[PDB]
Amino acid sequence: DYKFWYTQPVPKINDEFNESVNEPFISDNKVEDVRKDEYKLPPGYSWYVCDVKDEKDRSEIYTLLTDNYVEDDDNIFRFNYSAEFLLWALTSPNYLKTWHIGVKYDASNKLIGFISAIPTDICIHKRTIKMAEVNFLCVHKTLRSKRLAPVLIKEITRRINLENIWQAIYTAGVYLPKPVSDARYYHRSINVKKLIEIGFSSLNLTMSRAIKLYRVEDTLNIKNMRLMKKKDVEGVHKLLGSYLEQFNLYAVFTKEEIAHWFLPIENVIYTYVNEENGKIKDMISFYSLPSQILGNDKYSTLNAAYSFYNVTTTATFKQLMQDAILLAKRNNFDVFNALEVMQNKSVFEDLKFGEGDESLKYYLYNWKCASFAPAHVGIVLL
Numbered sequence: 001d002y003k004f005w006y007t008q009p010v011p012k013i014n015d016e017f018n019e020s021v022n023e024p025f026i027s028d029n030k031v032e033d034v035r036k037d038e039y040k041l042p043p044g045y046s047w048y049v050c051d052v053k054d055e056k057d058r059s060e061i062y063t064l065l066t067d068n069y070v071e072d073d074d075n076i077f078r079f080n081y082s083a084e085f086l087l088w089a090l091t092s093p094n095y096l097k098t099w100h101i102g103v104k105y106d107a108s109n110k111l112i113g114f115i116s117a118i119p120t121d122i123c124i125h126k127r128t129i130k131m132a133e134v135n136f137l138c139v140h141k142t143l144r145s146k147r148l149a150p151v152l153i154k155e156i157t158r159r160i161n162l163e164n165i166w167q168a169i170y171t172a173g174v175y176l177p178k179p180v181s182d183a184r185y186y187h188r189s190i191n192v193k194k195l196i197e198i199g200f201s202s203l204n205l206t207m208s209r210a211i212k213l214y215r216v217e218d219t220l221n222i223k224n225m226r227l228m229k230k231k232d233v234e235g236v237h238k239l240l241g242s243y244l245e246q247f248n249l250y251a252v253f254t255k256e257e258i259a260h261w262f263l264p265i266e267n268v269i270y271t272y273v274n275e276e277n278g279k280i281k282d283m284i285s286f287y288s289l290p291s292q293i294l295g296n297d298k299y300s301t302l303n304a305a306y307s308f309y310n311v312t313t314t315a316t317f318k319q320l321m322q323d324a325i326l327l328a329k330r331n332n333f334d335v336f337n338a339l340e341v342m343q344n345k346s347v348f349e350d351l352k353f354g355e356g357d358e359s360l361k362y363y364l365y366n367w368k369c370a371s372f373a374p375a376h377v378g379i380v381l382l
């Protein structure tokens with residue numbers, strides 16, 4: 001039915017546009033006309049201003065998401081973003097505190113809903129648009145299917161429009177009207193035995209053969225790959241910024257955004273560079289996103305690395321991503337996850353990735369344009 005979404009400026013399920021269409025559904029919007037009142041909540045609920053730089057507010061967000069956020073289709077793993085990860089994800093350059101929106105139940109003073117956005121410049125089919133990047137929509141499990149999600153979406157839309165921003169980018173595992181692209185997840189086992197025992201992976205292929213199949217030589221193809229430092233920011237900016245221009249959808253990073261999104265933070269973000277004759281010629285990056293293991297008496301956490309942005313000019317992309325796997329292994333990750341975006345799909349078979357069973361759909365709000373294969377996607381959202 002899509003009874004909420006069809007009231008919104010998004011494509012209808014049957015909409016199809018060719019390359020000559022690349023523009024808003026609704027243009028000529030006016031800040032002075034935006035609703036100035038918060039949207040009404042059901043009785044006993046209230047909007048809450050989450051200060052993610054406040055330890056208590058940030059821990060309430062963490063707890064809400066730890067207990068209630070995204071689970072896999074088989075309900076065995078739930079994402080477990082850390083408090084430090086949330087800080088990094090939500091306080092990117094020029095972030096707005098008004099875009100970190102909580103809902104509390106007054107009687108218990110408990111956070112039961114959350115939605116967030118950060119500002120980012122998005123190039124879609126070579127047009128660069130100031131957008132809001134919406135993430136972490138969460139409604140407490142006990143309150144599902146009470147139509148709270150539309151109210152959260154409408155309220156953050158209002159707050160984004162008050163900054164004279166009228167487009168948004170978001171991803172979801174569920175199908176909504178209507179993806180601009182759709183990218184399957186793929187998974188490269190690192191700690192084989194653990195993945196088998198938690199039912200992430202399967203045997204048939206004995207235990208010892210599986211361990212041998214996925215073994216990793218502890219030698220880099222690019223021997224001087226090293227952790228990124230502050231002096232590397234301009235070089236990473238130039239290397240990644242030039243690389244991303246080939247894609248139909250990417251973020252246009254400023255130097256300040258490069259510093260924020262790529263300077264290493266232990267157990268949050270890992271970036272490695274290859275410096276040659278002064279110049280950053282290759283880079284590898286992946287972020288940490290563990291999953292809670294629901295109902296396993298031996299293991300409580302899956303330590304997963306997620307491919308972020310990877311560029312090579314002195315090796316093949318397979319060689320580069322082989323080093324990415326090694327580096328994730330060296331930092332104690334159990335599995336290395338990646339989407340079939342950018343050049344990634346070309347190395348999945350040779351590097352012994354397995355196809356997952358879920359995909360990530362890319363969405364734009366108030367924008368109509370042609371869809372495209374995920375190899376043309378040049379952005380990875382958290």
Ligand SMILES: C#CCCCCCCCCCCCC(=O)SCCNC(=O)CCNC(=O)[C@H](O)C(C)(C)COP(=O)(O)OP(=O)(O)OC[C@H]1O[C@@H](n2cnc3c(N)ncnc32)[C@H](O)[C@@H]1OP(=O)(O)O
Nearest residue numbers: 002003004005136137138139144145146147148149166168
């Ligand atoms: C300009 C500016 C624009 C700014 C706004 C742009 C639009 C942003 C849309 C949201 C983007 C989300 C990005 C993500 O962060 S991804 C992660 C999704 N997080 C989870 O998976 C956590 C686990 N899960 C939950 O916490 C809840 O299930 C949710 C996701 C809150 C859903 O709430 P529940 O209580 O089920 O559903 P209710 O409150 O009755 O609302 C029904 C309507 O809602 C739609 N919907 C459902 N899931 C959605 C979802 N994930 N994103 C958007 N919409 C969603 C759904 O179709 C339906 O509407 P219809 O009637 O079908 O038109």
Ligand SMILES: [Cl-]
Nearest residue numbers: 218219220223
């Ligand atoms: Cl080495």
